[PDB]
Design an enzyme around this catalytic site. Structure first.
Site, PDB file in Angstrom:
ATOM      1  N   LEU A  43      79.603  62.190 -23.322  1.00  9.11           N
ATOM      2  CA  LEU A  43      78.150  62.285 -23.174  1.00  9.11           C
ATOM      3  C   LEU A  43      77.548  63.336 -24.095  1.00  9.11           C
ATOM      4  O   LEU A  43      76.407  63.188 -24.502  1.00  9.11           O
ATOM      5  CB  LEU A  43      77.781  62.653 -21.739  1.00  9.11           C
ATOM      6  CG  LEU A  43      78.154  61.617 -20.683  1.00  9.11           C
ATOM      7  CD1 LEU A  43      77.852  62.148 -19.285  1.00  9.11           C
ATOM      8  CD2 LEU A  43      77.440  60.293 -20.945  1.00  9.11           C
ATOM      9  N   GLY A  44      78.264  64.429 -24.334  1.00  7.98           N
ATOM     10  CA  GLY A  44      77.739  65.512 -25.140  1.00  7.98           C
ATOM     11  C   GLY A  44      78.791  66.580 -25.340  1.00  7.98           C
ATOM     12  O   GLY A  44      79.770  66.529 -24.615  1.00  7.98           O
ATOM     13  N   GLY A  46      78.923  71.030 -26.015  1.00  7.99           N
ATOM     14  CA  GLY A  46      77.956  72.058 -25.624  1.00  7.99           C
ATOM     15  C   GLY A  46      78.444  73.513 -25.606  1.00  7.99           C
ATOM     16  O   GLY A  46      78.222  74.232 -24.611  1.00  7.99           O
ATOM     17  N   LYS A  47      79.033  73.974 -26.718  1.00  9.36           N
ATOM     18  CA  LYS A  47      79.249  75.404 -26.911  1.00  9.36           C
ATOM     19  C   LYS A  47      80.428  75.884 -26.062  1.00  9.36           C
ATOM     20  O   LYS A  47      81.411  76.393 -26.602  1.00  9.36           O
ATOM     21  CB  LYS A  47      77.993  76.214 -26.550  1.00  9.36           C
ATOM     22  N   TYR A  48      80.303  75.735 -24.732  1.00 13.40           N
ATOM     23  CA  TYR A  48      81.311  76.216 -23.793  1.00 13.40           C
ATOM     24  C   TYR A  48      82.146  75.059 -23.233  1.00 13.40           C
ATOM     25  O   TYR A  48      83.061  75.302 -22.467  1.00 13.40           O
ATOM     26  CB  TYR A  48      80.660  77.034 -22.661  1.00 13.40           C
ATOM     27  CG  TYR A  48      80.345  78.453 -23.120  1.00 13.40           C
ATOM     28  CD1 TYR A  48      81.346  79.252 -23.672  1.00 13.40           C
ATOM     29  CD2 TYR A  48      79.054  78.972 -23.072  1.00 13.40           C
ATOM     30  CE1 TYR A  48      81.084  80.526 -24.145  1.00 13.40           C
ATOM     31  CE2 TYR A  48      78.779  80.250 -23.539  1.00 13.40           C
ATOM     32  CZ  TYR A  48      79.797  81.026 -24.071  1.00 13.40           C
ATOM     33  OH  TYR A  48      79.573  82.283 -24.536  1.00 13.40           O
ATOM     34  N   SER A  49      81.777  73.814 -23.564  1.00 11.85           N
ATOM     35  CA  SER A  49      82.329  72.638 -22.907  1.00 11.85           C
ATOM     36  C   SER A  49      82.007  71.326 -23.623  1.00 11.85           C
ATOM     37  O   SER A  49      81.096  71.253 -24.438  1.00 11.85           O
ATOM     38  CB  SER A  49      81.902  72.570 -21.474  1.00 11.85           C
ATOM     39  OG  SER A  49      80.653  71.932 -21.370  1.00 11.85           O
ATOM     40  N   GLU A  50      82.795  70.294 -23.252  1.00 15.42           N
ATOM     41  CA  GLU A  50      82.589  68.905 -23.627  1.00 15.42           C
ATOM     42  C   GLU A  50      82.414  68.098 -22.335  1.00 15.42           C
ATOM     43  O   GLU A  50      83.105  68.307 -21.362  1.00 15.42           O
ATOM     44  CB  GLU A  50      83.768  68.390 -24.444  1.00 15.42           C
ATOM     45  CG  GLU A  50      83.938  69.129 -25.755  1.00 15.42           C
ATOM     46  CD  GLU A  50      84.449  68.234 -26.867  1.00 15.42           C
ATOM     47  OE1 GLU A  50      83.789  68.195 -27.935  1.00 15.42           O
ATOM     48  OE2 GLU A  50      85.482  67.538 -26.646  1.00 15.42           O
ATOM     49  N   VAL A  51      81.415  67.216 -22.350  1.00 15.17           N
ATOM     50  CA  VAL A  51      80.896  66.531 -21.175  1.00 15.17           C
ATOM     51  C   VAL A  51      81.167  65.041 -21.315  1.00 15.17           C
ATOM     52  O   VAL A  51      80.825  64.451 -22.334  1.00 15.17           O
ATOM     53  CB  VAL A  51      79.382  66.772 -21.026  1.00 15.17           C
ATOM     54  CG1 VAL A  51      78.830  66.099 -19.786  1.00 15.17           C
ATOM     55  CG2 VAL A  51      79.032  68.252 -21.019  1.00 15.17           C
ATOM     56  N   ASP A 154      69.345  80.993 -18.052  1.00 12.48           N
ATOM     57  CA  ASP A 154      69.368  80.045 -19.154  1.00 12.48           C
ATOM     58  C   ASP A 154      68.491  78.842 -18.821  1.00 12.48           C
ATOM     59  O   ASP A 154      68.818  77.697 -19.138  1.00 12.48           O
ATOM     60  CB  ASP A 154      70.809  79.667 -19.545  1.00 12.48           C
ATOM     61  CG  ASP A 154      70.943  79.069 -20.947  1.00 12.48           C
ATOM     62  OD1 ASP A 154      70.215  79.510 -21.882  1.00 12.48           O
ATOM     63  OD2 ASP A 154      71.785  78.176 -21.119  1.00 12.48           O
TER      64      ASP A 154
HETATM   65  C1  LIG Z   1      76.664  68.022 -14.324  1.00  9.46           C
HETATM   66  C2  LIG Z   1      76.093  67.467 -15.576  1.00  9.46           C
HETATM   67  N1  LIG Z   1      75.798  66.217 -15.740  1.00  9.46           N
HETATM   68  C3  LIG Z   1      75.416  65.974 -17.064  1.00  9.46           C
HETATM   69  C4  LIG Z   1      75.079  64.733 -17.593  1.00  9.46           C
HETATM   70  C5  LIG Z   1      74.772  64.616 -18.941  1.00  9.46           C
HETATM   71  C6  LIG Z   1      74.799  65.746 -19.760  1.00  9.46           C
HETATM   72  S1  LIG Z   1      74.393  65.587 -21.472  1.00  9.46           S
HETATM   73  O1  LIG Z   1      75.043  66.646 -22.183  1.00  9.46           O
HETATM   74  O2  LIG Z   1      74.618  64.231 -21.860  1.00  9.46           O
HETATM   75  N2  LIG Z   1      72.783  65.841 -21.601  1.00  9.46           N
HETATM   76  C7  LIG Z   1      72.289  67.232 -21.554  1.00  9.46           C
HETATM   77  C8  LIG Z   1      70.906  67.296 -22.197  1.00  9.46           C
HETATM   78  C9  LIG Z   1      69.989  66.364 -21.416  1.00  9.46           C
HETATM   79  C10 LIG Z   1      68.563  66.452 -21.901  1.00  9.46           C
HETATM   80  C11 LIG Z   1      67.808  67.418 -21.014  1.00  9.46           C
HETATM   81  N3  LIG Z   1      66.503  66.843 -20.606  1.00  9.46           N
HETATM   82  C12 LIG Z   1      65.339  67.449 -21.318  1.00  9.46           C
HETATM   83  C13 LIG Z   1      64.113  67.520 -20.448  1.00  9.46           C
HETATM   84  C14 LIG Z   1      63.991  68.499 -19.470  1.00  9.46           C
HETATM   85  C15 LIG Z   1      62.791  68.713 -18.807  1.00  9.46           C
HETATM   86  C16 LIG Z   1      61.669  67.940 -19.097  1.00  9.46           C
HETATM   87  C17 LIG Z   1      60.406  68.224 -18.356  1.00  9.46           C
HETATM   88  C18 LIG Z   1      60.014  69.540 -18.097  1.00  9.46           C
HETATM   89  C19 LIG Z   1      58.841  69.806 -17.409  1.00  9.46           C
HETATM   90  C20 LIG Z   1      58.041  68.768 -16.970  1.00  9.46           C
HETATM   91  C21 LIG Z   1      58.412  67.464 -17.217  1.00  9.46           C
HETATM   92  C22 LIG Z   1      59.582  67.188 -17.904  1.00  9.46           C
HETATM   93  C23 LIG Z   1      61.808  66.949 -20.086  1.00  9.46           C
HETATM   94 CL1  LIG Z   1      60.437  66.039 -20.640  1.00  9.46          CL
HETATM   95  C24 LIG Z   1      63.007  66.738 -20.739  1.00  9.46           C
HETATM   96  C25 LIG Z   1      70.527  64.943 -21.495  1.00  9.46           C
HETATM   97  C26 LIG Z   1      71.907  64.912 -20.863  1.00  9.46           C
HETATM   98  C27 LIG Z   1      75.130  66.999 -19.251  1.00  9.46           C
HETATM   99  C28 LIG Z   1      75.434  67.093 -17.902  1.00  9.46           C
HETATM  100  S2  LIG Z   1      75.938  68.482 -16.994  1.00  9.46           S
END
Ligand SMILES: Cc1nc2ccc(S(=O)(=O)N3CCC(CCNCc4ccc(-c5ccccc5)c(Cl)c4)CC3)cc2s1
EC number: 2.7.11.1
Length: 329
Positions: A43-44, A46-51, A154
């Site tokens: 999925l991604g 990320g610096k400290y990890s791979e997801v 963070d």
């Molecule tokens: C336990 C875990 N499960 C997963 C499953 C996938 C992943 S990933 O690495 O594939 N990836 C990490 C990056 C994400 C993008 C973050 N969203 C941005 C966002 C955030 C907030 C908003 C927002 C803010 C305020 C108001 C409205 C919207 C808005 Cl508009 C946008 C996608 C997923 C890591 C983990 S860790």
């Protein structure tokens, strides 16, 4: 030296708990069985990890695996302890399991599966109401973790997952989070440059939960003004300059005086003299539908040099910006 500080709220919450709650170095990790999970796809990274997305073959449940890069065992224990303490809290990611590869000795956190709507789609379509709603949801997670004696350290868009189809949100990446203890000097070299509080940038170490509230304000600004990042520093020094060009230098110097902070001589050249700007200069025809008097009042009350004067999470939740969302609950 610098004047001490304590959190205005949840100050002593950890002091009243058993030591084991916060003394994560003592925590003994309960391993599950790695063979229960088959990795499906990356999925991604990320610096400290791979997801990865994975499947629990015990029951056919979709899961997410974070395979840790090498970090000190104490920092892994810290993250695990925090995740366990916060499990069940509103909008906190759920840690389901902890497994190690028997051969590579590599450790793996197993989480609940949550789908993320396509960023392009979501951003295209957001709406003033949606931003208020999701901001409220983030605030519920922050008030909870703060009340549980934990600072995230963070807060930023990358650490907020949304599933728009089911109106669901999760605060993730607890790897930098730490327990708040009154009097403790913390590492200032945390959080991404664009979201660093002034306290970090001027090297004031006795900070608290209120750091998260600055970061949240940075997020709000970027969303309502359609500018990411909002404070775009070229380095740690210029980061404070970018802030000062908006909030103004008078209040910055007042803050440094109040806490008797000694400023790096470098800042004394670069910082200069800046008026406090009005938020109206960032408003345009493309973002005006997101921007309201309420939004600006709320923003103003998060983005304050003085960590003690920022809104609490619980105060923020009572702000007029959220009146219609609270009415809906
Ligand atoms: C336990 C875990 N499960 C997963 C499953 C996938 C992943 S990933 O690495 O594939 N990836 C990490 C990056 C994400 C993008 C973050 N969203 C941005 C966002 C955030 C907030 C908003 C927002 C803010 C305020 C108001 C409205 C919207 C808005 Cl508009 C946008 C996608 C997923 C890591 C983990 S860790």
């Amino acid at each position: 030296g610098p004047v001490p500080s304590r959190a205005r709220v949840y100050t002593d919450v950890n002091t009243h708990r058993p030591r084991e709650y916060w003394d994560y170095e003592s925590h003994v990790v309960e391993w599950g069985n790695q063979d229960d999970y088959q990795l499906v796809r990356k999925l991604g990274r990320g610096k400290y990890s791979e997801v990865f997305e994975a499947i629990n073959i015990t029951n056919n449940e979709k899961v997410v695996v974070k395979i840790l890069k090498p970090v000190k065992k104490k920092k892994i224990k810290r993250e695990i302890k925090i995740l366990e303490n916060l499990r069940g809290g509103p909008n906190i990611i759920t840690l389901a399991d902890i497994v190690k590869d028997p051969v590579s000795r590599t450790p793996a956190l197993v989480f609940e599966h949550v789908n993320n709507t396509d960023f392009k789609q979501l951003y295209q379509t957001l709406t003033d109401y949606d931003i208020r709603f999701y901001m409220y949801e983030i605030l519920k997670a922050l008030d909870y973790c703060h009340s549980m004696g934990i600072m995230h350290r963070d807060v930023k868009p990358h650490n907020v997952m949304i599933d728009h189809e089911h109106r669901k949100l999760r605060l993730i990446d607890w790897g930098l989070a730490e327990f708040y203890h009154p009097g403790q000097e913390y590492n200032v070299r945390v959080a991404s440059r664009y979201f660093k509080g002034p306290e970090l940038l001027v090297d004031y170490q006795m900070y608290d939960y209120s750091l998260d509230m600055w970061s949240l304000g940075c997020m709000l600004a970027s969303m309502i003004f359609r500018k990411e990042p909002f404070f775009h520093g070229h380095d740690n020094y210029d980061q404070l300059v970018r802030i000062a060009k908006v909030l103004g230098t008078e209040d910055l110097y007042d803050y440094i005086d109040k806490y008797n902070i000694e400023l790096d001589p470098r800042f004394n050249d670069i910082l200069g003299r800046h008026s406090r700007k009005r938020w109206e200069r960032f408003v345009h025809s493309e973002n005006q539908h997101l921007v309201s008097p309420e939004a600006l009042d709320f923003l103003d009350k998060l983005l304050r040099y003085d960590h003690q004067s920022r809104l609490t999470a619980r105060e923020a939740m009572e702000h007029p910006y959220f009146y219609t969302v609270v009415k809906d609950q």
